[PDB]
Symmetry: C2
Subunit: 167 residues, 2 copies
Amino acid sequence: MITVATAECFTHANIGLTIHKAAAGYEDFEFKYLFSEEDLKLMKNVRVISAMFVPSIIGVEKLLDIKLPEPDFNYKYAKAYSEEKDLEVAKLMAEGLKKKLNVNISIGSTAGVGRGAICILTDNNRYLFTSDVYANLITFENIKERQKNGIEKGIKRFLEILKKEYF
Amino acid sequence: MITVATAECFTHANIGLTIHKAAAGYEDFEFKYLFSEEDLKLMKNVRVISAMFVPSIIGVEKLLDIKLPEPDFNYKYAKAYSEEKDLEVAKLMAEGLKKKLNVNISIGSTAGVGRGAICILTDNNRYLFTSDVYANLITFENIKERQKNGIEKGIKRFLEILKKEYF
């Protein structure tokens, strides 16, 4: 099977949970609209090993045996980075997760202040993009919209990548 | 902070995600209805370190450095146990988490065929309970009802335990 794992913060593990639901053939799920019927057939060849929500630096670091940069902001509930460090962390987590779990495709996501970042790392390439929504984890400005767009864009890109590289 | 981590399978990391959204003061989230305003004030003192959806044995094993029993059924997308091993695995994962991440409260959940199991392990005690719903991960029979019941029961027990032990 094509194995996937994720380490997600702003998208709340829903990239990986959607991939799982699609792969396991759930009849209805929140972001099913992103998958064509043919996509849903392709998805049955995918297995999710883990989808982790990892808001804390110490959690990411201990679970993946990596080191993250210091947060840019004081915030109790989650590591809070500017967009530059979110882009760096999404790559650090995707890379660490791929190594930890030996999966075909690893996904990292993080967003603090700004548009956040999603990294999709396959056996062949590393993709890294922001979301399309500027938001602020601390003030909650646009946070739900950023989470939604991050999950939609992460899934849309995952599907494109999966088809390009594996089908 | 009172730190929490979860390793969830049938509840799709939503016990730990609900704890996080309550703790971080989200004004709307799916299971917010389970919390009073006073419970939400207490929750501000909780931090989630990680909430992981870990359907794979090899996933769980590699992330938490534990060994899980062999599945009772063949199933491609997740480890599939009957009740006896679900109850063992919820406890093994809560114990593993608590060791790997050194949290105050760890929560394990798993359900294959049967009612599933949730373990809440605190600094002082271990709680282990089935959901109320018999379901089957492979056939999808009652899966969604069991998921929702497990989340609600998990969160309700977590709030009882948190109050009894920490407030």
